[PDB]
Amino acid sequence: SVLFISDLHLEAERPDITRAFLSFLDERARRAEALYILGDFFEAWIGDDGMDAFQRSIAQSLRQVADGGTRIYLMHGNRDFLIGKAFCREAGCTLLPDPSVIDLYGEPVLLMHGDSLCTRDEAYMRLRRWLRNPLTLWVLRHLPLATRHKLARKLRKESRAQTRMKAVDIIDVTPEEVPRVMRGHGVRTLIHGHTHRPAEHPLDIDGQPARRIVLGDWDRQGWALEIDANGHRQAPFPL
Ligand SMILES: CCCCCCCCCCC[C@@H](O)CC(=O)N[C@H]1[C@@H](OP(=O)(O)O)O[C@H](CO)[C@@H](O)[C@@H]1OC(=O)C[C@H](O)CCCCCCCCCCC
Ligand SMILES: [Mn+2]
Ligand SMILES: [Mn+2]
């Protein structure tokens, strides 16, 4: 089987989430063929050169699972799009670009964090375009570590303020973007996170049934989607 998780937002001051995650690694990821982490794995990331002791311990926990034979794939989210090759080397995982199409039991499956689908949120679309601009990435990595933390705190503050003011349909995926992006990648299945609204959505693409599976966030309970050749199930479990 294969496991999909996202939106853990791991941080030193949420040991309840960390403990649930490590137990999940021991009890389920170790026995899986592969684990996919579809963004927002950490609460924030300023660059691999800024990794703290907590984040290094998480890398070491992933590495134990990777060394056991489980293939681990990590995709950026909007909290942690600065994760790089040094982290993945320590963690024994493979960095997957957003978007990525994988082969899952013979089916092409599209994987994304999900925030790129939130095209009705023009303020966020503008921020994302700036944050991912190579010129922005260039100047950001020239900031001292402490100053990067400052700017990350400022982005979190403004995001918390602004997101509270937005309507639900502004922060969720744009409905018409789903068939558009899925058709472009030639898939009938899309798995993403970001929206913190775990669900499976059936839809039509060109007169054919398709599905969009949304992974749950870990603020109140853990979540995992498990797929094998015979079926799939996403279910929560207590922290
Ligand atoms: C190099 C290291 C330091 C710098 C890089 C650090 C990178 C890590 C920081 C992560 C911040 C991230 O939370 C911002 C973000 O993505 N917010 C959108 C997202 O909310 P999440 O809660 O993150 O899922 O998803 C929400 C739902 O889709 C969406 O609503 C949020 O987006 C916003 O709220 C954005 C606001 O609409 C616009 C904010 C503009 C802020 C500008 C601040 C600086 C201005 C200073 C000018 C003087
Ligand atoms: Mn998230
Ligand atoms: Mn997100």
Author numbering: 2 to 240
Paper text:
LpxH shares sequence similarity with metallophosphoesterases and requires Mn2+ ions for phosphatase activity.
PaLpxH was crystallized in the presence of Mn2+ ions, which are required for enzymatic activity. Two PaLpxH molecules were present in the asymmetric unit of the P21 crystal, and all 239 amino acid residues were unambiguously determined for both molecules. Furthermore, the high-resolution electron density (1.65 Å) clearly identified a stoichiometrically bound product molecule (lipid X, 2,3-diacylglucosamine-1-phosphate) and two Mn2+ ions in each PaLpxH molecule. The lipid X molecule was likely captured in E. coli cells because no substrate molecule (UDP-2,3-diacylglucosamine) or product molecule (lipid X) was added during purification or crystallization. In the EP complex, the phosphate group of lipid X (corresponding to the beta phosphate moiety of UDP-2,3-diacylglucosamine) is strongly bound to Arg80 through a bidentate salt bridge. W1 is positioned close enough to attack the alpha phosphate of the substrate in the ES complex, as deduced from the structure of the EP complex.
